[PDB]
Amino acid sequence: IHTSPYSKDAPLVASLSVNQKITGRNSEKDVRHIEIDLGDSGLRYQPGDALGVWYQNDPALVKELVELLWLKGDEPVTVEGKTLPLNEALQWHFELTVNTANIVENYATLTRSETLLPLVGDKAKLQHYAATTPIVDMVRFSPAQLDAEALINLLRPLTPRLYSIASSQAEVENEVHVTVGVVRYDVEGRARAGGASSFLADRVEEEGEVRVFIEHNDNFRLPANPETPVIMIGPGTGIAPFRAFMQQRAADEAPGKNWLFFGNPHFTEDFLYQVEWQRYVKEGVLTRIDLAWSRDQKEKVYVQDKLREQGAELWRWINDGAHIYVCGDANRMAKDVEQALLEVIAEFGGMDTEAADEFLSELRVERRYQRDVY
């Protein structure tokens, strides 16, 4: 517009306007619709961008870790040029909620943990213990006396988390919306949680401050040409940019057809933004939707199962020049959705495994196959 001085290390201090649970009362998962006010900042983004969000660790987790280590919490510590009491350094500048094989290995080694040492250099044992046991539970289970400097030396610096933007400024203005699945789990009877998602969910009331920046994604964007059809595949929190896409196309009043593929365990508990979609379908901006409810029956159903069953109509849309978008879990979802997409291109459209491979690839270079997976 004519400048913007906010970025990762110089974030905009914004205001948390809305923090709403969007999953049902008996969902297995807690998902928050969050709206942050951008005020007169002039911060701008496009559908497909992500919002960078700084967080602080739970003060109660910090107190727990420090007392396990025989520390007081005060104790001056130096972090990137600044002398801080232990407690403030841990709350604001160190990751506490992501364990790693190296941390596990250095703690074990540092404290000479009789119970952790057999894992040392044992490779995948280390990675498995770290995926399984948070750092505070690692020292709960094998506590030891540490000095404040030895601790902070073990730890990795705190970094912001990315959330796909769930709004379009064409519709919203002054605001950015995000779709936050909050990471909650227990460890041998203790409640644990992800750092940033529980910070947003639990530790900022309303209109309280959040430190925010835009991570642009120019490789995840609506077609120019409002007449072009778009197919959106976004189970779970992967739905978020597709809420941004529909706000945009509804706002621009794009006549182009829209197809959404969504999946999650339970219709009843986990149909994120479902009134919004039903309205889109009724106002005719959303042309089609296919739902995959994992745990709604005996057999597990996923989006990729709907993509195959919807094969011939999908193919019809591709040849009409559709753009295809995938967002959500990369670890398993993105791969199985890609193979369903190769199966469909072969099945309908003049098969040959190798040629379908080639086709999916020309699509990506043409910008007609785009993904944002994590």
Ligand X SMILES: Cc1cc2nc3c(=O)[nH]c(=O)nc-3n(C[C@H](O)[C@H](O)[C@H](O)COP(=O)(O)OP(=O)(O)OC[C@@H]3O[C@@H](n4cnc5c(N)ncnc54)[C@@H](O)[C@@H]3O)c2cc1C
- Using CB under 6 A as the binding rule, the residues of this chain from 237 to 276 that contact ligand X are 237, 240
Radius of gyration of the chain measured on its C-alpha atoms: 23
Taking the alpha carbons of 257, 263, 267, 271 in that order, is the dihedral positive or negative? negative
| Residue 52 binds ligand X, judged by CB under 6 A | no
Among 54, 129, 163, 293, binds ligand X (CB under 6 A): 163
Q: Which DSSP string do the residues of 167-214 spell out, in sequence order?
A: --TTTS-SEEEEEEEE-EEEETTEEEE-HHHHHHHHS--SS-EEEEEE
Among 17, 56, 87, 97, binds ligand X (CB under 6 A): 97
| Residue 57 binds ligand X, judged by CB under 6 A | no
Q: Are 107 and 113 spatial neighbours (Cβ–Cβ below 8 Å)?
A: yes
How many CB atoms neighbour CB 366 within 10 A? 10
Considering beta carbons, is residue 154 or 342 the nearer one to ligand X? 154
Minimum CB separation of residue 142 from ligand X in Å reads 16
| Residue 70 binds ligand X, judged by CB under 6 A | no
Among 38, 139, 180, 214, binds ligand X (CB under 6 A): 180
Nearest-5° Cα angle at 145, 143 to 147: 135
| Residue 102 binds ligand X, judged by CB under 6 A | no
Q: How many residues bind ligand X (CB under 6 A)?
A: 24
* CA–CA dist 176, 258 (Å, integer): 23
| Residue 289 binds ligand X, judged by CB under 6 A | no
| Residue 164 binds ligand X, judged by CB under 6 A | yes
**Tokens of residue 262, six digits:** 């969504």
Among 12, 38, 50, 152, binds ligand X (CB under 6 A): 50
Among 56, 111, 169, 179, binds ligand X (CB under 6 A): 179
Task: Give residue 86's Cα distance to chain centre.
Answer: 30
Q: Which of 259, 325, 315 is nearest to 286 (CA)?
A: 259
- Using CB under 6 A as the binding rule, the residues of this chain from 355 to 374 that contact ligand X are 372, 374
| Residue 162 binds ligand X, judged by CB under 6 A | yes
| Element holding 258 (H helix, E strand) | strand 258-264
- Using CB under 6 A as the binding rule, the residues of this chain from 119 to 158 that contact ligand X are 131-132, 134
Among 7, 13, 109, 185, binds ligand X (CB under 6 A): 185
Residues that bind ligand X (CB under 6 A): 50, 97-99, 131-132, 134, 161-164, 179-181, 183, 185, 194-197, 237, 240, 372, 374
